[PDB]
Ligand binder design. Structure first.
Ligand SMILES: O=C(NCC(F)(F)F)N1CCN(C(=O)c2ccco2)CC1
Length: 119
């Protein structure tokens, strides 16, 4: 019932994601010389460095907000991909499965902690 425990859990999950080769493309902004149409397709860029930064600045109030930004990384990849079989999109889908598998307990424990607080 630790209301604050999600933050370190999310830091540790981000560490795992940064160790994962699949996160490579999703660590930093898109170079518009390499992908000139990116910001035509993608209004709201997100990468894992921005997520980690936001977390470490104390600018997430809950793991749900972090989860919204991470999911934006994945939905941006799905919007930008020219094919459902592209290399980078395929990396996004594996990483998304990994993230969802690991974040599920973090969200459950946080929401449990908030309900116990309100009890
Ligand atoms: O250039 C980058 N990342 C920055 C870098 F290279 F420094 F890591 N990206 C990731 C986001 N994109 C995609 O989701 C995508 C789907 C299909 C093809 O690309 C575009 C390419």
């Amino acid at each position: 019932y630790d209301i604050q425990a999600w933050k370190k859990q999310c830091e540790e999950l981000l560490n795992l994601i940064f160790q994962c080769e699949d996160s490579e493309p999703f660590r930093q902004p898109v170079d518009l010389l390499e992908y000139p149409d990116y910001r035509d397709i993608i209004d709201t860029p997100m990468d894992f460095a921005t997520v980690r930064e936001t977390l470490e600045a104390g600018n997430y109030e809950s793991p749900m907000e972090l989860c919204k930004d991470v999911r934006l990384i994945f939905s941006n990849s799905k919007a930008y991909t020219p094919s459902k079989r592209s290399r980078i999109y395929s990396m996004s889908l594996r990483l998304s499965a990994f993230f969802e598998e690991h974040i599920s307990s973090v969200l459950s424990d946080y929401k449990s902690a908030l309900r116990f607080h309100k009890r």
